[PDB]
Design an enzyme around this catalytic site. Structure first.
Site, PDB file in Angstrom:
ATOM      1  N   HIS A  24     -10.978   6.775   9.294  1.00 46.52           N
ATOM      2  CA  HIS A  24      -9.906   5.688   9.938  1.00 46.52           C
ATOM      3  C   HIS A  24      -9.324   6.254  11.207  1.00 46.52           C
ATOM      4  CE1 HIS A  24      -9.972   4.549   5.519  1.00 46.52           C
ATOM      5  NE2 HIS A  24      -9.893   3.341   6.112  1.00 46.52           N
TER       6      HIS A  24
ATOM      7  N   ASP B 119       0.759  -1.431   0.092  1.00 36.17           N
ATOM      8  CA  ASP B 119      -0.052  -0.013  -0.007  1.00 36.17           C
ATOM      9  C   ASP B 119       0.892   1.135   0.148  1.00 36.17           C
ATOM     10  OD1 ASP B 119      -2.454  -0.804  -0.291  1.00 36.17           O
ATOM     11  OD2 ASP B 119      -2.992  -0.936   1.726  1.00 36.17           O
TER      12      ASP B 119
ATOM     13  N   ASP C 168     -11.481  11.887  10.267  1.00 39.28           N
ATOM     14  CA  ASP C 168     -11.206  10.756   9.150  1.00 39.28           C
ATOM     15  C   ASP C 168     -12.086   9.504   9.355  1.00 39.28           C
ATOM     16  OD1 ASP C 168      -9.582   8.578   7.622  1.00 39.28           O
ATOM     17  OD2 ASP C 168      -8.846  10.449   6.789  1.00 39.28           O
TER      18      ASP C 168
ATOM     19  N   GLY D 204      -0.621   2.981   4.965  1.00 40.39           N
ATOM     20  CA  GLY D 204      -1.997   3.511   4.715  1.00 40.39           C
ATOM     21  C   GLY D 204      -1.731   4.716   3.743  1.00 40.39           C
TER      22      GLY D 204
ATOM     23  N   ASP E 161     -13.502  10.789   3.824  1.00 43.49           N
ATOM     24  CA  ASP E 161     -14.105   9.612   3.419  1.00 43.49           C
ATOM     25  C   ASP E 161     -14.984   8.989   4.001  1.00 43.49           C
ATOM     26  OD1 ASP E 161     -12.185   9.525   5.607  1.00 43.49           O
ATOM     27  OD2 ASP E 161     -10.771   8.016   4.637  1.00 43.49           O
TER      28      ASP E 161
ATOM     29  N   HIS F  29      -1.311   8.368   9.263  1.00 45.32           N
ATOM     30  CA  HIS F  29      -1.010   6.866   9.518  1.00 45.32           C
ATOM     31  C   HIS F  29       0.452   6.769   9.738  1.00 45.32           C
ATOM     32  CE1 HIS F  29      -5.233   5.504   9.510  1.00 45.32           C
ATOM     33  NE2 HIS F  29      -5.029   5.745   7.963  1.00 45.32           N
TER      34      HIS F  29
ATOM     35  N   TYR G 293     -11.581   9.685  -1.549  1.00 42.16           N
ATOM     36  CA  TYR G 293     -11.283   8.953  -2.676  1.00 42.16           C
ATOM     37  C   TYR G 293     -12.309   9.416  -3.622  1.00 42.16           C
ATOM     38  CZ  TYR G 293      -8.015   7.539   0.782  1.00 42.16           C
ATOM     39  OH  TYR G 293      -7.122   7.254   1.850  1.00 42.16           O
TER      40      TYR G 293
HETATM   41  O1  LIG Z   1      -7.584   7.260   3.807  1.00 39.90           O
HETATM   42  C1  LIG Z   1      -7.160   6.582   4.351  1.00 39.90           C
HETATM   43  N1  LIG Z   1      -6.795   6.474   5.746  1.00 39.90           N
HETATM   44  O2  LIG Z   1      -6.641   7.729   6.277  1.00 39.90           O
HETATM   45  C2  LIG Z   1      -6.792   4.761   4.042  1.00 39.90           C
HETATM   46  C3  LIG Z   1      -5.818   4.155   4.464  1.00 39.90           C
HETATM   47  C4  LIG Z   1      -5.484   2.716   4.107  1.00 39.90           C
HETATM   48  C5  LIG Z   1      -6.377   2.473   3.127  1.00 39.90           C
HETATM   49 CL1  LIG Z   1      -6.299   0.473   2.448  1.00 39.90          CL
HETATM   50  C6  LIG Z   1      -7.543   3.178   2.359  1.00 39.90           C
HETATM   51  N2  LIG Z   1      -8.186   2.623   1.389  1.00 39.90           N
HETATM   52  C7  LIG Z   1      -8.211   2.883   0.023  1.00 39.90           C
HETATM   53  O3  LIG Z   1      -7.152   3.579  -0.322  1.00 39.90           O
HETATM   54  C8  LIG Z   1      -9.301   2.644  -0.530  1.00 39.90           C
HETATM   55  C9  LIG Z   1     -10.358   1.562  -0.274  1.00 39.90           C
HETATM   56  C10 LIG Z   1     -11.326   1.228  -0.944  1.00 39.90           C
HETATM   57  C11 LIG Z   1     -11.528   1.880  -2.218  1.00 39.90           C
HETATM   58 CL2  LIG Z   1     -13.126   1.411  -3.146  1.00 39.90          CL
HETATM   59  C12 LIG Z   1     -10.876   3.026  -2.463  1.00 39.90           C
HETATM   60  C13 LIG Z   1      -9.741   3.432  -1.760  1.00 39.90           C
HETATM   61 CL3  LIG Z   1      -8.745   4.507  -2.536  1.00 39.90          CL
HETATM   62  C14 LIG Z   1      -7.735   4.353   2.871  1.00 39.90           C
HETATM   63  K   LIG Z   2     -10.929   9.554  12.496  1.00 38.34           K
HETATM   64 ZN   LIG Z   3      -8.970   7.569   5.861  1.00 36.84          ZN
END
Ligand SMILES: O=C(NO)c1ccc(Cl)c(NC(=O)c2ccc(Cl)cc2Cl)c1
Ligand SMILES: [K+]
Ligand SMILES: [Zn+2]
Ligand SMILES: [K+]
Length: 399
Positions: free
Chosen positions: A178, A99, A176, A149, A269, A141, A313
């Site tokens: 996450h 990633d 966020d 991430g 997100d 992250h 995204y």
């Molecule tokens: O934003 C984040 N953290 O703040 C973060 C951290 C790790 C991951 Cl794996 C992801 N996930 C993605 O990238 C992602 C997942 C599903 C789809 Cl449909 C499209 C995407 Cl683009 C986001």
């Molecule tokens: K958060």
């Molecule tokens: Zn996120």
């Protein structure tokens, strides 16, 4: 004034990654198309006077060997030949893989967000700006010696470190989807940086933390015990329930901690239209956008504030949310009304906002564990105030 970080080189670097593409350009051009730029003070990214000063700034948090590996990763991706087995093993030891892959600008791209968020902190410290916005930052992250991430350098940790070293207390609020694990970890032992993340958590969902660990919540260690706060929420939550969930917590933290600065990560997100499709928040400003509710509440405290980006995204809908956040900040700080047409104005990315070219995202909303979380979090805030010997009205907070 209200500051906002940008620049031609900065925009170039923020748009050079394979994962986030031209998102930052859309964000700033929508802010520009709505005539918000003359209202804002441009904050230029920080530049340094030698390689040694740059290293000294970044290694305030990150290890020298990690910085070394990330710069070597950029060099390697600027030459055609592929990695040797020894270099692949080296990158693997810093999670510079999967990633978090390399690409030709990976170091300058990562560094750029640090330059922007450190300049934003400086502009608050010298009181040039009451609030500063950096939609190129928010990479929550990244850890001391590990990418995670798609975060390679933790601009937030470094900005907060600059703020606390100017007794200074910082409240960090992470909106966020996450969990903000990298910022939480950096300040795990530090009572003067109180971290609070609201996020989705469930089995197997990235990054895994910010939730039950009968299991209990971990919340800091040493003198930082009780200083890391988390509110995990189930999928499908809407603006109103997310707002009621976090609103009293925000007010309680401000009352008890009395922060010198607030730092907000505003990753987009959680929008109902993000392809994650987990939470159902909107950018609506009459059903009122959870994001706008929270930011307005935080700004009503009149504490110098840093607003950062993060996840998001669906690029046009991230632009639509952060444009409204930006206008809201101007209104709240200057006291000057910002009227935003419900239709997207003509500008170079206009075609990206089809098929209907409106500022509201294209979503039609619908729709006791939170009570238990509220009791648990108030108990933790009481433990924090006792440990740190702070003075506060239980009856005003319990209210
Ligand atoms: O934003 C984040 N953290 O703040 C973060 C951290 C790790 C991951 Cl794996 C992801 N996930 C993605 O990238 C992602 C997942 C599903 C789809 Cl449909 C499209 C995407 Cl683009 C986001
Ligand atoms: K958060
Ligand atoms: Zn996120
Ligand atoms: K802490």
């Amino acid at each position: 004034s209200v500051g906002i970080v940008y620049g031609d080189q900065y925009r170039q670097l923020c748009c050079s990654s394979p994962k986030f593409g031209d998102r930052y350009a859309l964000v700033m051009d929508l802010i520009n198309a709505y005539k918000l730029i003359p209202e804002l003070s441009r904050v230029p990214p920080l530049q340094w006077d030698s390689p040694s000063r740059m290293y000294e700034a970044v290694t305030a948090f990150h290890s020298t060997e990690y910085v070394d590996a990330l710069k070597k990763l950029q060099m390697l991706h600027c030459e055609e030949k592929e990695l040797t087995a020894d270099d692949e093993l080296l990158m693997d030891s810093f999670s510079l893989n999967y990633d978090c892959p390399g690409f030709p600008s990976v170091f300058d791209y990562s560094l750029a967000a640090v330059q922007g968020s450190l300049a934003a902190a400086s502009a608050l410290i010298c009181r040039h700006c009451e609030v500063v916005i950096n939609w190129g930052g928010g990479w929550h992250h990244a850890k001391r010696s590990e990418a995670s991430g798609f975060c390679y350098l933790n601009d937030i940790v470094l900005a907060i470190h600059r703020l606390v070293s100017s007794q200074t207390r910082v409240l960090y609020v992470d909106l966020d989807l996450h969990h903000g694990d990298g910022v939480e970890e950096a300040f795990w032992y530090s009572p003067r940086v109180v971290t609070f993340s609201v996020h989705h958590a469930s089995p197997g969902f990235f990054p895994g933390t910010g939730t039950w660990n009968l299991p209990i919540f971990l919340n800091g260690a040493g003198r930082g015990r009780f200083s890391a706060f988390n509110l995990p929420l189930e999928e499908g939550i809407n603006d109103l329930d997310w707002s009621n969930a976090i609103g009293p917590i925000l007010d309680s933290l401000n009352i008890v901690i009395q922060p010198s600065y607030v730092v907000v990560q505003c990753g987009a997100d959680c929008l109902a239209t993000d392809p994650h499709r987990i939470f159902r928040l909107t950018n609506f400003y009459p059903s009122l956008s959870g994001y706008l509710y929270a930011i307005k509440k935080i700004l009503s405290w009149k504490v110098p504030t840093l607003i950062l980006g993060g996840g998001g995204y669906n690029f046009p809908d991230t632009a639509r949310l952060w444009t409204r956040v930006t206008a809201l900040t101007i209104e709240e700080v200057k006291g000057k009304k910002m009227t935003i047409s419900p239709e997207i104005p003509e500008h170079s990315y206009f075609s990206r906002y089809g098929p209907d070219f409106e500022l509201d995202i294209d979503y039609f909303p619908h729709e006791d564990s939170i009570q238990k979380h509220h009791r648990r979090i108030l108990e933790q805030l009481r433990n924090y105030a006792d440990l740190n010997k702070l003075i506060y009205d239980y009856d005003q907070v319990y209210q």
